Every structure is written in structure tokens, then in C-alpha cells.
Design a protein around this ligand. Structure first.
Ligand SMILES: [Ca+2]
Ligand SMILES: [Zn+2]
Length: 404
């Protein structure tokens, strides 16, 4: 499926430390040690809702991972999905296709590297059916005892390690399950936390054939199946927003560990903070939705959006504000001024520190502040290095995606 166009990626000479990331499971910062090809599955967007700045912040976070892996010479397999299953006046495809296209233009304008496999959830029905078949034949799944709606459910206890990815207690799991798409009170389930794998065909819903009856795939098995068939057991990073910690990434990992037998679906679970506005979460109800195309219409440099979001650590829940935008504009204007000078101070140390800072769990505040300091040195004192203004500009392009 079509994603978006990639920008030119300049080559930064030299090399920096290997990337280390916070793992949500272990709750600690550990090395990311991929093979020659580095693998990444980030959960995509839902076209039936508005894609806002918090969502963009997530894909920008994994853009840095992608760019840092490219800087270290890895070839990358970036896989991303689109949750076009479940959730009007005009058909659900019409207004749904438009949100996906606007997402492409928002990603392209932000110079986000596109995934190598953009897999719609409707183009992966067979892969899901394959995994459910394996899960049923091993006893990990069952068919609920219902006459008209023989739903297929994944046993919460199919994996001994269930709950390792989120750390949540069972009550917290039950409370989140109800509010994030689960059906803890569906009759016939052996355990409240059992996860739907195949929803039985209901009258009025589109359906797909399968050996266990017609219906639709479950949310978590969609992602589990796409990642398994496109990347396999050697998945370096499972990524997404923090709301996906439970249930989504717990069950999606449990499904895959059940079929493959491996202890860990992904070597790293990497979760981003949310981006709110005025002390409030962003949603269509509150009318506080801060969109990327809204800012672009208002004449906001996309690079300024990146720097605004990078001014905070990717794991911090934080808030967008006009003060944040103003500081990003001032920073962008100052970085552009210094990198335009014909000569500047040597940039070897700051580029080294930037690479170290980004390797240290994507410490973009330290990276931004270190670049601020060199720019201020360049503009206050000058220098005799005729290459460092361009060297810093291309470093900022390749590693941060910012176009000066
Ligand atoms: Ca290199
Ligand atoms: Zn997902």
C-alpha cells in the first residue's frame, strides 16, 4: 500500500555510540543491538478518528530511531499498519480514505521517513486467519459457547509471562480493558481478560471467510500477524503511544509468543508520552484538537513543529502551547542564522555530543541545548572553519530531520 515520499538523507561522516532505549517491560534503559537489518513495527493510525499532534509526535520519535539506525549504517525494515477495521452518512471508506491521505501529507511535510511496508489491516486478513488456526490447534485459543456468535478468544493464561510487558495488576488491567476496547463481561468467556481473536459475523457488518466461521479479526492479532509475517521473531522494537501498553501491546505480544514459543515478541517495547493542550487531553469532544495541517495552514514551518516536540523528552507526557511554538521558531531562526555563516568554530565536539545524547534514550533536550550553544558561539565569536556551518546543517538534517 502507498505511503509517502522520503526526503533526501545526507550522510554524516564519522560515527557515534550505539542506540540505547528505555524498555517499558524491564523499565530500564538497555542497548538496542540489531542485526545488519534493524526491524521496527510502529502501530499506525485509525482513519475513523482525527490524527493529531500527539500521534505525529509518536511517528517523529521513531523517525529519530530510524535516522539513528541509518546513521550507524544499518539497513532498516520499518513496518507500519492502518487500523481500518471496525472504528456513517457517507460510506466509511470515503471519509476514512481522506484521513489516511492527509496523514501522508502531514508525514511528508514533516520529512518523516516512510515505512518500507505500509500494511492495511484489511490487506492482512489471511495472515490473521493463519495465526488463529495455530492458536486454536495448540489450545491457546477457544471458541466461546455461543449458538449464533461463535467468537474466538485468546486465553489470557496462554503465556506464563502474561503481564510482563505492561506491569499492571489485574484490576488495573480490567479497568483499562473495558475503556480501551475489551469485553470483560461478554458471557461465556473463561476469563474476563481473554482477548477476542475472531469476532463472529454480525448482521450488518462486513465479514471475511475463515475455517472457524465468517467474521472480522481482533485488533491485537492484526498487529501481531503483520509483524510476524513481515519481520519475524527478530523484532527489535515494538512501538507506539503509551495508551497501547495495555491492552494492545500486551495481547499482541502474548499472541505472538504463544505461536512462536519465543520468550519476547519484541526486544524493546518503546512508548511515547502524550501531547495535550491546556491541561487537557486532545479529542473531538473538547474541541481542543491541535492538528498538524492546522498549524501548516497557519504558516508554521514543519521543522519548527519537530523542534517544538523535540524540546521535550519523547517519554514525557507534556503539553503543546504557543510558548512552545515561539521557542521552536526562535530556535529554528537561530540555527538557520549560524549554519548560514561562511565560517564558524569547529563542530567536531558538538556533533559528537549530539550523537551521544541521541544514543542516550533519545535525549533531544540535551541535543537541542548543545546545538544552541554552538550556534551562540558561532554568532558571538565566529571561527575559521569554513565547513562546520554546513556540517552542522547536514547533521541536523540527517539525525533530526530538521531542514535549516
Ligand atoms: Ca555513518
Ligand atoms: Zn497496533
Amino acid at each position: 500500500m502507498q505511503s509517502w515520499s522520503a526526503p533526501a538523507i545526507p550522510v554524516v561522516p564519522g560515527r557515534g555510540p550505539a542506540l540505547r532505549l528505555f524498555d517499558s517491560a524491564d523499565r530500564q534503559v538497555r542497548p538496542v543491538t540489531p542485526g545488519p537489518t534493524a526491524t521496527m513495527y510502529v502501530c499506525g493510525i485509525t482513519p475513523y478518528d482525527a490524527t493529531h499532534l500527539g500521534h505525529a509526535a509518536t511517528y517523529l520519535t521513531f523517525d529519530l530511531v530510524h535516522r539513528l539506525w541509518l546513521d550507524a549504517g544499518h539497513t532498516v525494515q520499518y513496518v507500519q499498519n492502518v487500523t481500518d477495521v471496525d472504528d456513517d452518512g457517507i460510506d466509511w471508506r470515503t471519509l476514512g480514505d481522506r484521513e489516511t491521505q492527509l496523514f501522508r501529507e502531514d508525514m511528508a511535510a514533516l520529512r518523516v521517513l516512510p515505512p518500507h511496508d505500509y500494511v492495511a489491516a484489511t490487506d492482512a486478513i489471511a495472515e490473521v486467519v493463519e495465526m488463529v488456526e495455530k492458536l486454536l490447534a495448540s489450545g491457546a485459543a477457544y471458541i466461546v459457547e455461543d449458538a449464533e456468535y461463535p467468537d474466538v478468544y485468546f486465553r489470557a493464561d496462554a503465556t506464563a509471562q502474561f503481564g510482563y510487558e505492561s506491569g499492571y495488576d489485574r484490576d488495573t488491567m480490567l479497568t483499562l480493558f473495558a475503556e480501551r476496547g475489551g469485553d470483560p463481561d461478554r458471557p461465556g468467556k473463561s476469563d474476563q481478560l481473554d482477548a477476542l481473536l475472531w469476532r463472529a459475523e454480525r448482521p450488518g457488518e462486513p465479514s471475511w471467510p475463515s475455517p472457524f466461521g465468517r467474521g472480522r479479526p481482533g485488533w491485537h492479532v492484526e498487529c501481531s500477524a503483520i509483524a510476524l509475517t513481515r519481520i519475524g521473531t527478530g523484532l527489535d522494537i515494538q512501538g507506539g503511544g503509551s495508551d497501547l501498553i495495555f491492552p494492545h501491546h500486551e495481547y499482541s505480544a502474548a499472541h505472538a509468543e504463544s505461536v512462536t514459543g519465543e520468550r519476547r515478541f519484541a526486544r524493546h517495547y518503546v512508548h511515547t508520552g502524550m501531547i495535550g493542550w491546556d491541561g487537557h487531553k486532545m479529542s473531538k469532544s473538547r474541541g481542543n484538537l491541535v492538528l498538524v495541517s492546522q498549524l501548516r495552514a497557519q504558516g508554521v514551518d514543519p521543522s519548527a513543529i519537530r523542534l517544538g516536540l523535540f524540546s521535550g523528552h519523547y517519554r514525557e507526557d507534556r503539553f503543546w502551547s504557543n510558548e512552545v511554538l515561539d521557542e521552536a521558531n526562535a530556535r529554528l531562526a537561530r540555527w538557520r542564522s549560524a549554519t548560514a555563516l561562511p565560517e564558524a568554530p569547529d563542530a567536531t565536539d558538538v556533533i559528537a555530543r549530539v550523537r551521544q545524547y541521541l544514543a542516550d534514550d533519545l535525549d533531544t533536550p540535551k541535543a537541542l541545548a548543545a546545538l544552541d550553544g554552538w550556534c551562540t558561539d558561532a554568532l558571538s565569536y565566529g571561527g575559521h572553519d569554513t565547513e562546520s556551518p554546513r556540517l552542522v546543517a547536514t547533521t541536523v538534517d540527517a539525525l533530526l530531520g530538521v531542514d535549516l
